[PDB]
Design a protein around this nucleic acid. Structure first.
Ligand code: ZN
Lengths: 314, 139, 189, 61, 65, 317, 122
RNA sequence: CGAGACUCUGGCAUGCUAACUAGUUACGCGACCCCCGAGCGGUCGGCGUAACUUCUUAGAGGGACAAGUGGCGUUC
């Protein structure tokens, strides 16, 4: 019965928005990684002019920024880029604290922990690097790890033996056993290259995605596939709500919303007006971030803008 | 609490240091109104005469200049005055003030925030200059 | 507000011809404090209509051989020339400048058409940007002629041409040269 | 008397040396009688001329 | 690449009637120097990796080691 | 009042009386004339953009092959007639329609097909009297393939002439070989059998759709005379010219030089300066040395039969 | 002007042929996969190659261009070549036939066909 | 083969690597000024430690490919 509506639209960038992270501690600062090499800390404002004010322009990178993630406290940020360098931020000032060199190729995603002290990273070097918060080089986890670009690595906020998820473009979804960083569970079900993984807030489901439009959903406990969903265009981004047991998905022009009890499609999220440029491709969707408010979705577009979504119930 | 950036014309390179101050803009130790080719005095006043004195109030500005010629050093400073207040308003003031004040400058002249890359071409043999050639005679 | 030379304003300055209006500068957002700006205005075609026309009068006044790079020499000749206009007329001298430009550029010109050795010009039309370009050239050249070998100053003799053309009077050099090019054209038709 | 113009299209560049420009001309008394002209100097689309005759015919010497 | 592929050698051999002068140029190959050719290939040549054959899966079988 | 691209090609700015104006977005973007986009800039704010339904489209195409026009229409020409179908089902009584209308009722005459049936300056009085060039709910279409399908449903429409339509006088092409009529007047080869056995067929369509067609019963057209002649060897190369048998065999690219292909636009008064009072003839290029001519030029020699008395010094293409 | 070259054109088409599946419409992702496979010289060359790959992807997403021979697009093509409509145009009721065609099958013992129609001879 | 590709140069990097034969910033110390009625402020290519690379220099790596949009194109 719940719908979305294009509530508001943010303007700060020349380049495409690639990653957005929210935070439950601070419900007015939400952070945007971009391809004009900048990260805008947005002060949420929800006025008539816009839904938010661009507050800080984090500048410490030299190439495209492919990821951003905050700490459990809303004062630190960590953002990979395609310069190869992983840059730790401090949100109070806009000045780095660490600088994590140790990949050769472009770093695609950055693993952040529920413990708030684990940084072990994976790039287009196809290579997992063992570090710490300090940046302490333990070992180069490469031993039967991947064969293509490691696209996204996340952790699980689990009270059990904690589980990482490290996909690739080699159609693999892998489970490395922590306190070993040694590989146990592998998953061969997808076609085409993989692009985004989102883990359940329960601790039992991961949500793979990619080129084929079909999103495998895997039981994390037994290691068995549970739900395949269909696709429109290419999946770019996936997210999990904690309360609603849903799956949101980034289609190219649109956003396909789900319900994971009956594969129930909910709503399609798009606006285009002018039919003169109908031969021009729609601006794609790139990123997706569930806000811990329960009612707010943020997605960034290839037309270098972030558009916000609010839940109209009923 | 301090931001130091440069500006640049042909070979001149002027570096302006800004910190939380009380409205002094001195280039090379001496005031803005004192710099000698005063036929171009307003071109050095243009970052002030467009943004007003009130933006240059919690900011102290030293400018350090080398290289170039007279005119090229004048334009190298007005880059660096302007680029610094912009860069000061980024790190210490919100971004919305930075955009507001950056937009006032660029619409007056794009030169104030990005520099000309046009530098002197190499002279080649057979003539006095880069393209020119000597006279020749027939018959 | 942005005063030229800190003492001359732009909002008084009123363009008559719509033909020349988009190809003559400062009115509102072209308003700059000094003529000297040093931007790439000849980077591609039709960019030299967006530069301030006082700087156009500058860059065509350094033009001769002995003066051929000296721009601060010239923006001083300009600055002293407006204040002689103001003391002879009282008008905003930028308005006197524009009224001298408009009355100066000819409107039909001749053009040689035919084989080599045959001289039969036909009258053609004069472009608006060229009529700007022709006028400034005809204005600056008259400052050289009555002031090459006499006591009068070129910051002064510029202001005697730039007033006598805004009258459209016969005393100006840039008017007699419009009264010839556009006299010859109407014998070519 | 003295009329005006509107450059509607730039058709080509005529003349002996490639000098004059052959230009499609609208009037500014918004009459749809487009008498089409040759100018001297640079002219782009959307300019406005100033004639002393609108009686120029397509005649060859 | 004329300056690290060809090898110019110029001589002056004598005879009864005058001088002959010879020129010998040796454009070196690729496959870096086991006395043979340079390290760096031709800057025109664009070697593309041969089409690597990959196995296509149909059924989602999770090969868990 | 469905608007068509031909209404803006003739520039029928008639958004004043008919006020239910609906149109297709595609049929205005496909127009390559700039004065139509000039028409699109100001006036068409009174009309509305709309597409028809795929249920409505297929039922238009059913009697389209039954009126024998489905290959003669364009693809965008299909949707405009289906766009009239939703308007007629919306506003007008559907109870006054028909489909699968009527037979041919051949009215065989002793009139030659190439006779000037109602060509304006031709007279057998009828002058021009210089006012009549502009004297030469529904729709405004000037395409007869569009106009044929309308009146067989019994759908009175109008044109740039503000009055309604009652008479439809045009020409179609029936295959003399496979008995297949197309509404196209441009093609010279058949669409079903592919021969040059298309012949000119005049029609007359009323508002109800009384198809009665003057098949020209005259043996000057019904003639096997100039039809058999031996053909040269099939030639393959850059400059071979095979004698144009099919509508699509791959001819080599032979083109005129653009300094020869263009004529004089002698109307335009920007004209005085420079060259001779005519176009310069191309004597330099190898378009001229291979004697490449226009496909429209020399067409009267195509109509001459091959086995005839040509003069002893001619050679054509 | 700015005209591409055989080294640009003929080598970019091979990337299309072998690894179409990894390609996309970005300049900057086609370029990052270009160095993974093309053992290239200097970066200006691979930028022109990646730009022609991106332009060629744009040309493909309308329809197949002449230069390609794709193992994936031709099976897509054959599954768009197999347009099988409901009624083929060789199963029809009435086909009008000349009287001189009629006398042939009466002699070629197929005069029993009733789908024909002898028309009025023109 | 030539053309192109190439090499050098130029332009950009508040990103990386560094610097007692390059600097900047800070802190000492001194000289000097107006003073206030002490200072602070200031100028110091005046000379000493520390912070570090914006300026200087030179190494690696990125950067631009007609890429994106709109028209024109036998639409490539
Ligand atoms: Zn036929």
């Amino acid at each position: 019965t719940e719908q979305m509506t294009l509530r508001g639209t943010l303007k700060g960038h020349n380049g495409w928005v690639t990653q957005i992270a929210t935070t439950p501690q601070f419900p007015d600062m939400i952070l945007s990684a971009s391809r004009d090499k900048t990260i805008i800390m947005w002060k949420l404002t929800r006025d008539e002019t816009n839904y938010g004010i661009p507050q800080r322009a984090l500048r410490g990178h030299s190439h495209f920024v492919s990821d951003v993630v905050i700490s459990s406290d809303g004062q630190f940020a960590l953002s990979g880029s395609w310069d190869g360098t992983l840059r730790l931020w401090d949100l109070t000032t806009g000045t780095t604290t660490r600088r994590f060199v140790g990949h050769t190729k472009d770093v695609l995603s950055v693993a952040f922990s529920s413990d708030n002290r684990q940084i072990v990273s994976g790039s287009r070097d196809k290579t997992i690097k063992l570090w710490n918060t300090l940046g302490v080089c333990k070992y180069t986890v490469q031993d039967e790890s991947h064969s293509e670009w490691v696209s996204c690595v996340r952790f699980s906020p689990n009270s059990s033996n904690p589980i990482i998820v490290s996909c690739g473009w080699d159609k693999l979804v892998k489970v490395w056993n922590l306190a070993n960083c040694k590989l146990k569970t592998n998953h061969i079900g997808h076609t085409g290259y993989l692009n985004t993984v989102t883990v359940s807030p329960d601790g039992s489901l991961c949500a793979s995605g990619g080129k084929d439009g079909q999103a495998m959903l895997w039981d994390l406990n037994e290691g068995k596939h549970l739900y395949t969903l269909d696709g429109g265009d290419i999946i770019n981004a996936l997210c999990f709500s904690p309360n609603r047991y849903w799956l949101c998905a980034a289609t190219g022009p649109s956003i396909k919303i789900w319900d994971l009890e009956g594969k129930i499609i909910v709503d399609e999220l798009k606006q285009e007006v002018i039919s003169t440029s109908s031969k021009a491709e729609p601006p794609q969707c790139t990123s997706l971030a569930w806000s811990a408010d329960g009612q707010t979705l943020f997605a960034g577009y290839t037309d270098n803008l972030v558009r916000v979504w609010q839940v109209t119930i009923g | 609490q301090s931001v130091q950036v440069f500006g640049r014309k042909k070979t001149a390179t002027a570096v302006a240091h800004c910190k939380r101050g009380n409205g002094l803009i001195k280039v090379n130790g001496r005031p803005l109104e004192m710099i000698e080719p005063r036929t171009l005095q307003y071109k050095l006043l243009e970052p002030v005469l467009l943004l007003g004195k009130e933006r240059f109030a919690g900011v102290d500005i030293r400018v350090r200049v080398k290289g170039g010629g007279h005119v090229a050093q004048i334009y190298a400073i007005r880059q660096s005055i302007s680029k610094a207040l912009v860069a000061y308003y980024q790190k210490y003031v919100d971004e919305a003030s930075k955009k507001e004040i950056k937009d006032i400058l660029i619409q007056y002249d794009r030169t104030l925030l990005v520099a000309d890359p046009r530098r002197c071409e190499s002279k080649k043999f057979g003539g006095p200059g880069a393209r020119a050639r000597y006279q020749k005679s027939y018959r | 507000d942005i005063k030229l030379f800190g003492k001359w304003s732009t909002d008084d300055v009123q363009i008559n011809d719509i033909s020349l209006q988009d190809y003559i500068a400062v009115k509102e957002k072209y308003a700059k404090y000094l003529p000297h700006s040093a931007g790439r205005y000849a980077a591609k075609r039709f960019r030299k209509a967006q530069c301030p026309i006082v700087e156009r009068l500058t860059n065509s006044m350094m033009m001769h051989g002995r003066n051929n790079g000296k721009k601060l020499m010239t923006v001083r000749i300009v600055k002293h020339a407006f204040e002689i206009i103001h003391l002879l007329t009282g008008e905003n001298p930028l308005q006197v400048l524009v009224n001298a430009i408009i009355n100066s550029g000819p409107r039909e010109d001749s053009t040689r058409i035919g084989r080599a050795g045959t001289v039969r010009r036909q009258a053609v039309d004069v472009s608006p940007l060229r009529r700007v370009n022709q006028a400034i050239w005809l204005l600056c050249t008259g400052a050289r002629e009555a002031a090459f070998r006499n006591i009068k100053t070129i910051a002064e003799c510029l202001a005697d041409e730039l007033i006598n053309a805004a009258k459209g009077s016969s005393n100006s050099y840039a008017i007699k040269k419009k009264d010839e090019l556009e006299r010859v054209a109407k014998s070519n038709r | 008397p003295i009329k005006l113009a509107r450059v509607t299209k730039v058709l080509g560049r005529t003349g002996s040396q490639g000098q004059c420009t052959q230009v499609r001309v609208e009037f500014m008394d918004d009459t749809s009688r487009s008498i089409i002209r040759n100018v001297k100097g640079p002219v782009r689309e959307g300019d406005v001329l100033t004639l002393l005759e609108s009686e120029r015919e397509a005649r060859r010497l | 690449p004329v300056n690290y592929y060809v090898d110019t050698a110029v001589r002056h051999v004598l005879l009864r009637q005058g001088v002959l002068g010879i020129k010998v140029k040796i454009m070196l190959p690729w496959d870096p120097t086991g006395k043979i050719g340079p390290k760096k290939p031709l800057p025109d040549h664009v070697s593309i990796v041969e089409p690597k054959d990959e196995i296509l899966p149909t059924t989602p079988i999770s090969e868990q080691k | 009042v469905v608007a068509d691209a031909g209404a803006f090609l003739r520039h029928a700015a008639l958004q004043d009386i008919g006020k239910n104006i609906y149109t297709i977005r595609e049929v205005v973007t496909e127009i390559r004339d700039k004065a139509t986009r000039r028409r699109l800039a100001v006036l068409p704010y009174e009309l509305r953009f709309k597409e028809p339904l795929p249920e409505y489209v297929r039922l238009v195409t059913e009697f389209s092959k039954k009126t024998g026009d489905y290959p003669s229409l364009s693809a965008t020409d299909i949707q405009v007639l289906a766009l009239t179908y939703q308007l007629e089902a919306e506003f007008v009584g559907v109870s006054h329609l028909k489909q699968e209308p009527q037979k041919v009722k051949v009215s065989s005459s002793i009139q030659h097909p190439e006779t000037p049936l109602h060509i304006s300056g031709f007279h057998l009085g009828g002058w021009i009297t210089p006012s009549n060039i502009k004297q030469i709910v529904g729709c405004l279409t000037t395409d007869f393939a569009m106009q044929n399908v309308l009146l067989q449903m019994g759908l009175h429409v109008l044109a740039v002439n503000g009055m309604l339509i009652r008479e439809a006088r045009s020409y179609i092409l029936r295959c003399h070989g496979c008995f297949k009529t197309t509404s196209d007047m441009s093609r010279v080869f058949c669409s079903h059998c592919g021969n040059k056995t298309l012949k000119k067929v005049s029609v007359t369509v009323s508002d109800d759709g009384t198809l009665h067609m003057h098949f020209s019963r005259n043996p000057k057209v019904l003639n096997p005379r100039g039809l058999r002649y031996s053909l040269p060897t099939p030639k393959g190369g850059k400059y071979a010219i095979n004698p144009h048998l099919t509508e699509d065999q791959r001819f080599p690219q032979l083109r005129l030089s653009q300094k020869a292909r263009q004529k004089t636009n002698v109307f335009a008064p920007d004209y005085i300066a420079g060259v001779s009072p005519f176009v310069e003839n191309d004597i330099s290029s190898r378009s001229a040395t291979l004697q490449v001519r226009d496909s429209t030029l020399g067409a009267g020699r195509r109509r001459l039969n091959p086995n005839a008395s040509r003069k002893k010094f001619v050679k054509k293409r | 002007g700015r005209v591409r070259t055989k080294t640009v054109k003929k080598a970019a088409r091979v990337i299309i042929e072998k690894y179409y599946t990894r390609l996309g419409n970005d300049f900057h992702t086609n370029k990052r996969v270009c160095e993974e496979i093309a053992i290239i010289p200097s970066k200006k060359l691979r930028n022109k190659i990646a730009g022609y790959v991106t332009h060629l992807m744009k040309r493909i997403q309308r329809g197949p261009v002449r230069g390609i021979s794709i193992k994936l697009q031709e099976e897509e093509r054959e599954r768009r070549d197999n347009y099988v409509p409901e009624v083929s145009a060789l199963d029809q009721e009435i086909i009008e036939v000349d009287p001189d065609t009629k006398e042939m099958l009466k002699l070629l013992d197929f005069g029993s066909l009733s789908n024909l129609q002898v028309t009025q001879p023109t």
